[PDB]
Amino acid sequence: PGIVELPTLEELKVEEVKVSSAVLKAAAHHYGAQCDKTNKEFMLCRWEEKDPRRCLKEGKLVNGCALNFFRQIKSHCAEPFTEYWTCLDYSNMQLFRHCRQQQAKFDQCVLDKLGWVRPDLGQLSKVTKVKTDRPLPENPYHSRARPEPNPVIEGDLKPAKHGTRFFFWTV
Amino acid sequence: MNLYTVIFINILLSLTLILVAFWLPQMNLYSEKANPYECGFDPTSSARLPFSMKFFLVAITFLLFDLEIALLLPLPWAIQTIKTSTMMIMAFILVTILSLGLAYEWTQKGLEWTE
Amino acid sequence: MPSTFFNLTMAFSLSLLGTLMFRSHLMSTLLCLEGMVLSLFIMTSVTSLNSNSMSSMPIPITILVFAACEAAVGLALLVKVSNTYGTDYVQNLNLLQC
Amino acid sequence: PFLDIQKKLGISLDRHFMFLSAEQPYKNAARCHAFEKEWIECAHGIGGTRAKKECKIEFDDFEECLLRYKTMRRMHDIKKQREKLMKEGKYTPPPHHSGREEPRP
Amino acid sequence: RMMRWNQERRRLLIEDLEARIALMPLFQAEKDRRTLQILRENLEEEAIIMKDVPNWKVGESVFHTTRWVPPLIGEMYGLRTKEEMSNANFGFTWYT
Amino acid sequence: MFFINILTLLVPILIAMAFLTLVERKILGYMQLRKGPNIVGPYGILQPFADAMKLFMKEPMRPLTTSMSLFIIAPTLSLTLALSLWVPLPMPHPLINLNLGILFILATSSLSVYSILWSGWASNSKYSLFGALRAVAQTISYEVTMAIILLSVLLMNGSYSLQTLITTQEHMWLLLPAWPMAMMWFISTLAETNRAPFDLTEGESELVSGFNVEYAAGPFALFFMAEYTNIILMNALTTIIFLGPLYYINLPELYSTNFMMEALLLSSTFLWIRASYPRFRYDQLMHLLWKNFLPLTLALCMWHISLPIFTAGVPPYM
Amino acid sequence: MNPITLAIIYFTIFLGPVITMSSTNLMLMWVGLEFSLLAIIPMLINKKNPRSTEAATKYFVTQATASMIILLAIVLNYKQLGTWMFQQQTNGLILNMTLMALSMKLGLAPFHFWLPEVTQGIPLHMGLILLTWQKIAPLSILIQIYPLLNSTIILMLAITSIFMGAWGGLNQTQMRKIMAYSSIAHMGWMLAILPYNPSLTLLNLMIYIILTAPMFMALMLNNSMTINSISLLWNKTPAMLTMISLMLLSLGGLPPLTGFLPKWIIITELMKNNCLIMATLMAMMALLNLFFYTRLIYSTSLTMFPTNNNSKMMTHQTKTKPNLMFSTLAIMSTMTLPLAPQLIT
Amino acid sequence: AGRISAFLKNAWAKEPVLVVSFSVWGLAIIMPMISPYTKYASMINKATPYNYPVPVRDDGNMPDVPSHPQDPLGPSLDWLKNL
Amino acid sequence: YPSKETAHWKPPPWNDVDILKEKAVTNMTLNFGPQHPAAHGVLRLVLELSG
Ligand SMILES: CCCCCCCCCCCCCCCCCC(=O)OC[C@H](COP(=O)([O-])OCC[N+](C)(C)C)OC(=O)CCCCCCCCCCCCCCCCC
Ligand SMILES: CCCCCCCCCCCCCCCCCC(=O)OC[C@H](COP(=O)(O)OCCN)OC(=O)CCCCCCCCCCCCCCCCC
């Protein structure tokens, strides 16, 4: 068949976040609260257009929003966040329940500065509407034309002509 | 990889122990040394003869009950379902049916040993 | 996966060949039946795991349940045969020709 | 089925897990969900004979997704040509295929 | 006590899953970008290797449809090292 | 470093097994108004090493009627499965972290039963055959009952891992919610480990020695090591499951110390029970585990199905 | 058997084929087959004699092997197509293995060697239950996949089934063996018409069931297991000789009995599909079947074999054994040829 | 009835294991039908977010779904927090 | 239709219960003692056991 069209390394080049998973989980709730709109736009485009090559711009926007978020944290709340993700990184599961004083101090810092409020229980996990100017793909599966059904026969149900017509049986 | 490594280490350790146990001490074996043990007398018959089993029905019941265990074992993931009423009813039905089978066999003396 | 599935199919073929080619031991025939069952379970399980068909993952457990009921009934019949004859010999189980 | 008691009563005792693209636990899509969906959408309403004749493209795509025969043949041809070029020495692997690269998250 | 502690554990699990949900779009973007990069360098290597093979289309799909087919582990790690292939195959299973 | 971890798990478990033999001799003696070994070594502490060296410098038996392959295979299989069952236990961190830990435990225990069975059949003797058949009946009864017990307990726990059991018992022992099935699990571990009153396979008075009556020296030592390692193993599993040691993230040494103390107490309880009670008859063991334990186990399994549903205390998946 | 276990066993015997016919999933059809086999074994071995034990053992291992081959076909189809039904493009090897295993479950030649032996040594009511009820579910499975099957292998199985059934019925004197070879021949006819028109397969199955049921009931009247035992029926139940003769002639396919109708319409459909050689060979072997039926008729009805002295005491005693459903089935299997367009669809 | 109570006392004296088993079976049957927390288990399992909440495309016609996670609209878990 | 290969056959019994030769009960014989803890040292208990 036809060859596959996939973008080049220059199109796939972006400023990646060289940030560990414990750091991400420490900053998880505020990243989900502040950078929510761009992330939801990227998830909407990914779940509408199944092709990942149609969403590279949205992915780069997501990376840019995450970079801006972490740069803001580094600018204002460096030390409490540093000790918070360190205490998170000590645990094997990175459980939130082991480090609550560091979480409280980091939350206080990002509350008195930057006005950020941690999301409550059940807020990040609910379905949100999102406004976008990207058109809805009418044929996401690249489906061919469906074959037409059989020409169903209509009409009144007349009796059988000359009975059953089974050999010599009259009716 | 780590589990395979420690299993192999256990295998090597036990093989080394039985190998040194068989090649370290002095060997002196003769016919009466290696004849089978029957409390000082010769065995009347071979031990490969048929040996009657008085709990064979309980063993077959154990096969069926072990498969009932296999059915009941996905419960710790089944309790996470959205429709907990259906799961609870189905689990109750399964355990009640198992208990009724056990009670019927107990009534019909299947748990008792033959002879 | 295809080499593994071919080996599992050949294992089923060998177990079926053992079932179809009797020796003196009905217990050995039942063991060949259980080997066929085991090959079927492994084939179904690796197919479900390869295709990520968690909806069809209860099917191997159902196979095990019904096959264990089959093995249970076979053991009960072997008990009856041994009570009749003293052995489980298929050469003793032959008096229905006339 | 030989008897359509399930369709007459409207129940679904076993009709909801007949294929890969059926209902799945926790919405974990099976492999070739899209291909099987396209095959069933094509084949629905036209009968078995017309489905075999006219939905051959969808069936072939679904079969290729499920068994990956042509993908295996293509990868085997690529690797065989690569190892032949290595044997005659007129090709070298790139660094990112030979183990040393610049990783990305 | 088990009821109260299990309810608290459920709340903690929901908090952890919400953290995962908040981190998921970035992970998805990075994962598909990495997959596209690996497929691109595999395509370039296929162009280099089989340029002399007759009747060979570089990057030809095996599907009649033009929609996206997510690549297999064998597709995206076939031309890389055997240790990386084994890490992709048995890594999670053999990590204990 | 992983090999060093293997060594520092395996070697201390073996030394603890040997000193479990010594402490069984001492505790049984002091419960029998005598002293037990205090001559070989300072306080008898060189007695297990003396016994091990004597057994490994005595010649083994290779009887004429005996199937050599299975006769050799069974004791090394028993020791390997004992150490394999030891490998995934968390104290509070396991050497090998598994998801289906208790399923691994059940499979390895049944394979150890197979080691006993193959030893009894390979040693072509009538007392060995008696020991094998008694092992078959015993493992039938305790297998079904212990499987249902562990199913109910982990239904309360929520997953098959054992660090999850530590997290479950972070605030309270499972003995308080699940003490009847804790008693039935304790009896099941006695029957699994073949300890009195449910030994019945190394029947000292009924048989001569049972399944290992033809085994001598080295392989007999392997069987004894496997059995006593299984004793410490099952008591360690019991205290991990039911009597949750205090776990703190900053220091796991407190967990290890509490686990050690409770496991020592349960092992001493095993020796205490062996001193106290006479042996069951092996049909009475099956009748017990199938007529008293099993109906109550099914009822409590239904109760633990219902309990998180009507209390909304369904445990977390992770 | 206490009524609790009677209800459990009979309900599972009923439930097996019902699940098989109602099931969309091949796995549920297979577990219906498992239900039928497992539930019917204890009633086979219920009399607890060595012959019943041998019959139960042979039936168990045969059906277990055939069910394992069925399960192999189902798993291979699930591997190839990802679904739980042979839809249209399943492999011909898979379909042929399904056909072969279902033919071994049905008991048609050359997989027929167990059926006269299993039918012997079991009581007459269990032979009836076997030879009527146990064939519905495998036939339903075959009917569901009729356009996919291989006509060559099906026709070979059918022609050897009819040949071996005719020869076996010619040789045997035991009534259970005679009925088993009759089952083999009629199953051959049903399989022969299966790929072309399964409606005729169902018609022949229903005609065979309503002919086999009262013949087994008439055997059940006096426990006549032998040609001689059914031959002295004139002293025991003289009023049943005419219906015995008519039902045996209907089994032979003689016009104007209604048992001529399945063979007639199957031959007609084969002629429509241009298999004249197969149709003619099947008809000649059906004539051989009619020969051993006619010898049975000569023994029981047209001649009068010598009787015993204790038959006087048996005539002194009175019986209530023939049920209400015997005569209905006998009449509907004897005098229903003029309703042939209604019997066909 | 007096004879029923006498039989129950005799069973409790001689075979208490079966009495406890039947009582626990009955309690496990009847307890979820009377407890007020029974709906809460299904609601907790529904509220547990194993899958990503896929956003919907807003056409301006549904006002019930929230635009942002920190909005008053949507299925809040205050009942679980205060449970 | 008797032939050389089937002339040795007998008709089946009227009640399908065949008269079989009574198989000898092969009970296991055990020497309980004299070297046995329960045999008190000098007892040779010959035990005929079924199971
Ligand atoms: C690991 C944690 C600790 C575990 C315990 C460890 C310390 C104790 C160890 C003692 C030594 C044991 C040595 C082996 C003993 C073997 C004998 C034996 O145990 O036999 C079992 C005996 C058997 O008794 P039996 O056999 O004598 O009884 C006769 C029975 N017939 C006639 C049928 C033969 O007891 C049991 O089976 C009971 C098991 C435990 C039951 C617990 C029930 C608790 C209450 C439940 C709830 C009740 C209320 C319900 C709701 C009401 C609401 C209104
Ligand atoms: C004397 C002969 C003895 C023969 C018998 C040997 C018995 C060994 C001990 C008992 C084993 C019982 C069965 C265990 C099967 C594996 C259990 C299991 O759950 O393994 C899964 C685990 C990781 O999986 P999971 O927990 O999901 O974790 C994923 C994220 N961490 O781990 C894995 O996925 C690792 C997969 C491999 C684990 C088993 C390794 C076995 C090694 C071979 C042993 C035999 C060697 C051959 C004979 C040598 C000569 C005698």
How many CB atoms lie under 10 A from the CB of residue G230? 23
CB contact under 8 A, C72 and B50: no
CB contact under 8 A, E5 and F171: yes
Q: How far apart are CA F237 and CA G282, in angstroms?
A: 71
Count: domains in chain C: 1
Contact at 8 Å (CB) between F95 and F6? yes
Non-local (6+) Cβ contacts of G1 within 8 A are G9, G46
Q: How far apart are CA C63 and CA G71, in angstroms?
A: 9
Ligand number nearest CA of B7 is 2
Collapsing DSSP to helix, strand or coil, G101 comes out as helix
Residue G146 DSSP class: G
Q: How far apart are CA A26 and CA A40, in angstroms?
A: 20
Q: How far apart are CA A97 and CA A100, in angstroms?
A: 6
Contact at 8 Å (CB) between G136 and G17? yes
Instruction: Characterize A6-25 residue by residue with b for buried, 16 or more Cβ atoms within 10 angstroms of its Cβ, and e for exposed.
Output: beeeebbebebbebeebbbb
Collapsing DSSP to helix, strand or coil, I31 comes out as strand
Contact at 8 Å (CB) between G180 and G116? yes
- Residue F219: cis peptide before it, omega within 30 degrees of 0: no
Which of G213, G35, G10, G60 is CA-nearest to residue G137? G35
CA distances from A142 to A12, D40, E61 (A): 24, 15, 15
Q: How far apart are CA F267 and CA D69, in angstroms?
A: 59
- Measure H77 CA to nearest chain A CA, in Å: 5
Collapsing DSSP to helix, strand or coil, A166 comes out as coil
Q: How far apart are CA A67 and CA A44, in angstroms?
A: 21
Tell me how many residue pairs between chain C and chain D have CB atoms under 8 A apart: 25
Task: Tell how far CA E78 is from the center of its chain.
Answer: 13
Q: How far apart are CA F32 and CA C80, in angstroms?
A: 51
Q: How far apart are CA G20 and CA G39, in angstroms?
A: 14
How many CB atoms lie under 10 A from the CB of residue A131? 13
CB contact under 8 A, B45 and I31: no
Query: What does the block give as tokens for G183?
Result: 């089952």
Taking CA B84 as the corner, what is the angle to CA B78 and CA B90, rounded to the nearest 5 degrees? 70
**Residues paired with residue I29 on neighbouring β-strands, in sequence order:** I48
Q: Helix H segments across A19-145?
A: 21-26, 28-34, 36-48, 56-76, 78-90, 101-112
Q: How far apart are CA F98 and CA B3, in angstroms?
A: 9
How many CB atoms lie under 10 A from the CB of residue C87? 16
Contact at 8 Å (CB) between B98 and B68? yes
Burial class (CB in 10 A: 0-12, 13-18, 19+), F12: exposed
What residues are in contact with ligand 1 under a 6 Å CB criterion? F 175, 180, 182-184, 186-187, 197, 238, 242, 273, 277, 288, 291-293, 296; H 15, 17, 20, 23-24
**Ligand 2, residues F96, F99, F112, F114: which to mutate, most atoms within 8 A of Cβ?**
F99
CA distances from E34 to E30, E76, F259 (A): 6, 10, 46
Task: Look at chain F and count its residues.
Answer: 318
How many CB atoms lie under 10 A from the CB of residue E13? 19
Q: Could you tell me the residue range of the domain that residue G122 belongs to?
A: 2-344
CA distances from F200 to F76, F122, F132 (A): 22, 19, 10
Collapsing DSSP to helix, strand or coil, A122 comes out as coil
- F97-106, Cβ contacts within 8 angstroms, sequence gap of 24 or more: F97/E96, F97/F161, F97/F163, F98/B3, F98/E96, F98/F161, F99/F159, F99/F160, F99/F161, F100/F160, F100/F161, F101/F160, F101/F161, F101/F162, F102/F150, F102/F154, F102/F160, F102/F162, F103/B73, F103/F160, F105/F237, F106/F147, F106/F150
- Are chains D and I in contact at 3+ CB pairs closer than 8 Å? no
Between the CA of A42 and the centroid of ligand 1 the distance, in Å, is 61
Backbone angles phi, psi at F38, to 5 degrees: -135, 5
Please report which helix (H) or strand (E) contains residue I30, including its range.
strand I28-32
CB contact under 8 A, A16 and D47: no
Collapsing DSSP to helix, strand or coil, H57 comes out as strand
Q: Could you tell me the residue range of the domain that residue C86 belongs to?
A: 2-98
- End-to-end CA gap in chain E: 32
Q: How far apart are CA F269 and CA F263, in angstroms?
A: 10
CA distances from G26 to C66, D2, G98, H22 (A): 14, 12, 11, 40
Q: Which residues of E touch D71 (CB under 8 A)?
A: 62, 72, 74-75
- Domain-wise residue ranges, chain B: 2-115
Three-state SS for D32-71 is CHHHHHHHHHHHCCCCHHHHHHHCHHHHHHHHHHHHCHHH
Non-local (6+) Cβ contacts of G250 within 8 A are G211, G257, G258, G259, G260, G333, G334
DSSP assignment string, chain F: -HHHHHHHHHHHHHHHHHHHHHHHHHHHHHHTTS----SSSSSSTTHHHHHHHHHHHSPPP--TTS-HHHHHHHHHHHHHHHHHHHTT--SSS-SS--SSHHHHHHHHHHHHHHHHHHHHHHTT-HHHHHHHHHHHHHHHHHHHHHHHHHHHHHHHH-SS-SHHHHHHTTSS-STTTSHHHHHHHHHHHHHHHT-TTS--SS-SSSSSSGGGSS--SHHHHHHHHHHHHHHHHHHHHHHHHTSPPP--SS-SHHHHHHHHHHHHHHHHHHHHHHHH-PPPPHHHHHHHIIIIIHHHHHHHHHHHHHHHHHH--PPP--
Contact at 8 Å (CB) between F151 and F303? no
Task: Look at chain C and count its residues.
Answer: 98
- Residue I12: cis peptide before it, omega within 30 degrees of 0: no
Which residue numbers of B have CB closer than 8 Å to H's CBs?
80-85, 88, 92, 96, 99
- F218 vs B22, B62, B72: nearest CB: B22
Q: How far apart are CA F233 and CA F217, in angstroms?
A: 24
Which of G193, G166, G190 is CA-nearest to residue G180? G166
Count: domains in chain G: 1
**Residues paired with residue A129 on neighbouring β-strands, in sequence order:** H56
Collapsing DSSP to helix, strand or coil, A129 comes out as strand
Please report which helix (H) or strand (E) contains residue I46, including its range.
strand I45-49
Give the type of residue at F108.
T
CB contact under 8 A, H66 and A125: no
Task: Tell how far CA F155 is from the center of its chain.
Answer: 22
CA distances from G207 to G132, G171, G335, G344 (A): 11, 25, 12, 11
Q: Which CATH number fits domain B2-115: 2.170.190.11, 3.40.50.300, 3.40.50.261, 1.20.58.1610?
A: 1.20.58.1610
Give the type of residue at E86.
S
Which of F187, F140, F129, F110 is CA-nearest to residue F286? F140
CB contact under 8 A, E69 and D65: yes
Show the beta-strand stretches assigned E in H1-83.
Answer: 56-57
Please report which helix (H) or strand (E) contains residue B98, including its range.
helix B84-107
DSSP assignment string, G243-291: HHHHHHHHHTT-TTSTTHHHHHHHHHHHHHTT-HHHHHHHHHHHHHHHH
Q: How far apart are CA A130 and CA G143, in angstroms?
A: 53
How many CB atoms lie under 10 A from the CB of residue F98? 19
Contact at 8 Å (CB) between E31 and H59? no
Task: Indicate whether residue B1 lines ligand 2 (CB < 6 A).
Answer: no
Chain E stretch 8-67, residues whose beta carbon is closer than 8 A to a beta carbon of chain F: 9-10, 12-13, 16
Pairing mode, if any, of strands A129-130 and H56-57? parallel
Query: What does the block give as tokens for F189?
Result: 């571990």
Collapsing DSSP to helix, strand or coil, A130 comes out as strand
CB contact under 8 A, C86 and I9: no
Gaps in chain D following residue numbers (C to N > 2.5 A): none
CB contact under 8 A, A147 and D54: yes
Q: How far apart are CA A132 and CA F237, in angstroms?
A: 57
Burial class (CB in 10 A: 0-12, 13-18, 19+), C57: middle
Backbone angles phi, psi at I45, to 5 degrees: -80, 105
Residue C22 DSSP class: -
- D28 vs C2, C50, C52: nearest CB: C52
Q: How far apart are CA C22 and CA C16, in angstroms?
A: 11
Task: Tell how far CA G242 is from the center of its chain.
Answer: 23
- A1 vs E22, E40, E64: nearest CB: E64
Q: How far apart are CA G204 and CA F231, in angstroms?
A: 68
For CA atoms H11, H14, H16, H17, give the dihedral sign: negative
> What ligand 2 atom has the least distance to the C-alpha of E96?
31
- C72 vs B50, B63, B71: nearest CB: B63
Collapsing DSSP to helix, strand or coil, G231 comes out as helix
- D31 vs C2, C51, C56: nearest CB: C51
Nearest chain C residue (CA) to I16 = C96
Burial class (CB in 10 A: 0-12, 13-18, 19+), B115: exposed
Judge whether A75 is closer than 8 Å to chain F, CB to CB: no
Contact at 8 Å (CB) between B10 and F84? yes
Taking CA F191 as the corner, what is the angle to CA F264 and CA H19, rounded to the nearest 5 degrees? 105
At how many degrees (to 10) do helices F101-122 and F68-86 cross?
160
- End-to-end CA gap in chain A: 60
Give the type of residue at A113.
K
CA distances from F292 to A110, B94, F140 (A): 61, 20, 15
CATH number for the domain including C24? 1.10.287.3510
Burial class (CB in 10 A: 0-12, 13-18, 19+), B96: middle
Three-state SS for B31-79 is HHHHCCCCCCCCCCCCCCCCCCCCCHHHHHHHHHHHHHHHHHCCHHHHC
Candidates F249, F251, F318: best to mutate against A (most CBs of A within 10 A) is: F249
Taking CA D80 as the corner, what is the angle to CA D76 and CA D82, rounded to the nearest 5 degrees? 120
Q: How far apart are CA A30 and CA C52, in angstroms?
A: 34
Q: Which residues of E touch B3 (CB under 8 A)?
A: 94, 96
Residue G302 DSSP class: I
